[PDB]
Amino acid sequence: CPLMVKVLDAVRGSPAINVAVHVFRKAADDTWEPFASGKTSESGELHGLTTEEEFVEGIYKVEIDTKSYWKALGISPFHEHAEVVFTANDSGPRRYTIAALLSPYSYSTTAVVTNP
Amino acid sequence: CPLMVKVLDAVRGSPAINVAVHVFRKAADDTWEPFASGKTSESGELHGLTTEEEFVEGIYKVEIDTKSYWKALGISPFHEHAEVVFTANDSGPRRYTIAALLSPYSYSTTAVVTNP
Amino acid sequence: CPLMVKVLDAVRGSPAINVAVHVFRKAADDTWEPFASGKTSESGELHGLTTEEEFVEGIYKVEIDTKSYWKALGISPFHEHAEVVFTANDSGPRRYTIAALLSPYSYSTTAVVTN
Amino acid sequence: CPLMVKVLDAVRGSPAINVAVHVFRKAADDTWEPFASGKTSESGELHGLTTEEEFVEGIYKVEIDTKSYWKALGISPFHEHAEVVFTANDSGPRRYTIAALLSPYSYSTTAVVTN
Ligand SMILES: O=S(=O)(F)Oc1ccc(-c2nnc(-c3cc(Cl)c(O)c(Cl)c3)o2)cc1
Ligand SMILES: O=S(=O)(F)Oc1ccc(-c2nnc(-c3cc(Cl)c(O)c(Cl)c3)o2)cc1
């Protein structure tokens, strides 16, 4: 609920299904510790990554495995992945949706941040 | 259900609320006849524009009133509106979502088309 | 030149070459009158559309024939065309670049307005 | 030059000027080693990062310091930075332009790869 990832495919005009997503959180020693991971559904959405308790203040990295997506579809894309890096929950809990729109040589990403 | 419009604001990181949307359909004489209109909700979504019966094959124009949106927020933007023009239902009924991501001098639009 | 149009292809990662572009100016009766046109070059650019003298304040529409571009590449696209509609304003900077990034079911456009 | 980076501002409709850009090359041990850096010019461009000799095949990361850019304009942004990660491949065209379009809560990036 606190963190959701939606992915769309600009070539097909569809949700981007079965996209692997890995989330990391910056540790006190400045390394990127694994936080959560999952795959987008048939709707292009990934829910259930974390809980309000576990999703504390910090710097998070959402890595969307765009190359693995395009290669699973038999296409040779430009980027390795799309990375979204942001400070979260620094003014108390918020709900974050990270959205991405994918093409083989381009991608756009935006955030929708709401206060419960 | 057959036609939905979602609008997001890239400056605020939020849904774009209260955005006026006008839909037109090309008539047999090549003019743009009014088809439907409405405003985005607090979620940035506009539902209820049309029915499966009324939404026949044709060329449709979805005009998103981006200038009126930015000016209602006291901002002077570049574009008059964003226009999305497409042939619909030419291989039988489909469900269309027209999405747009807005900035004062830029916007992206994509379609998600599904077969029920 | 006061107005440049640049078109890019997000599928191939290249300029979008030989794309037809039509520019219209809004007339007093709210109809769109032909203003300038051309085809993008090998660099995806279209220069020479107008001059400082002719490009007066007003509402302009740049129509990019995206459907023909995709069909020539053997790809089925969503949109009939991409349209960019804006007001030219003398108080702002002098030079307008209208950029468009094309995919089969999506496009993005931005304006880069400089002196 | 084999590698150009161009940064644009979607709020003001302008080049994004004086933005710090850092380029890294992936090392054999999977760490990111500094490769080239600079600040975008008045045209939002950063030329001169590398040469044909130095820009061998491999995985590169271009990090754009978007947070500092927005803060200097007095705007609160979402991202820490924008990152563009890609493989340089000799079979493809020779010249890579990495373009980024910035908004406070969003960015877009494309690659224009030509000969
Ligand atoms: O959950 S619904 O709103 F119903 O269906 C939708 C869910 C999500 C989206 C959506 N979210 N972001 C976008 C989206 C994101 C980017 Cl970077 C973009 O360039 C464009 Cl044109 C759209 O679309 C659009 C529709
Ligand atoms: O010599 S170059 O600077 F490379 O030629 C170029 C000139 C302009 C652009 C360019 N300007 N805006 C964009 C561009 C525009 C849109 Cl809507 C966008 O989504 C993205 Cl990711 C980039 O690309 C890219 C290349």
Domains of chain A, residue spans = 1-116
- Residue C60: partners with Cβ closer than 8 Å, 6 or more residues away: C23, C24, C25, C26, C35, C85, C86, C87, C88
Strand partners, A38: A21
CB–CB contact A84 D87 (8 Å):
no
Q: What is the CATH number of domain A1-116?
A: 2.60.40.180
**D20-26 vs B14-15, strand pairing mode:** unpaired
DSSP one-letter code for A11? T
DSSP E strands: which ranges in chain B? 3-9, 14-15, 20-26, 32-39, 45-46, 58-64, 79-88, 95-103, 106-114
Strands B3-9 and B95-103: parallel
Q: Ligand 1: distance of its center to the CA of B42 in Å?
A: 15
Nearest listed ligand to the Cα of residue C16: 2
Check pocket membership of A110 for ligand 2, CB cut-off 6 A. no
Nearest CA-CA partner of B39 in B23, B66, B21, B24: B21
Residues with CB under 6 A from ligand 1: A 6, 8, 99-101, 108-110; B 6, 8, 45, 97, 99-101, 108-110
Candidates B59, B58, B57; CA nearest to B92 is B57
Alpha carbons within 13 A on the beta-carbon side of C102:
29
Residue D71 has which token pair?
């803060």
- Taking the C-alpha atoms of residue C47 and residue C38, their distance in angstroms, rounded to an integer, is 9
Method: X-ray
C-alpha B110/C-alpha B101 separation (Å) is 9
- How far apart, in Å, are the Cα atoms of A35 and each of A61, A104, D13, D38, D65? 9, 27, 37, 33, 24
β-bridge mates for residue B106, sequence order: B103, C110
Q: Is B57 annotated as a binding residue?
A: no
User: What is the Cβ-side half-sphere exposure of residue B71, based on CA atoms within 13 angstroms?
Assistant: 9
Indicate the fold that domain C1-115 takes in CATH. Immunoglobulin-like (2.60.40)
Q: How far apart are CA C84 and CA C97, in angstroms?
A: 12
Cα separation, A16 vs A18, whole angstroms? 7
Query: Which has the closest alpha carbon to C55: C18, C94, C19?
Result: C94
For tokens 């239902």, name the residue. Answer: B89
Minimal CA separation from C5 to chain A, in Å: 19
Q: What's the CA gap between B63 and B65, in Å, rounded?
A: 6
Q: Are A104 and C13 in contact (CB under 8 A)?
A: yes
Instruction: Characterize B57-67 residue by residue with b for buried, 16 or more Cβ atoms within 10 angstroms of its Cβ, and e for exposed.
Output: ebbbbbbbbbb
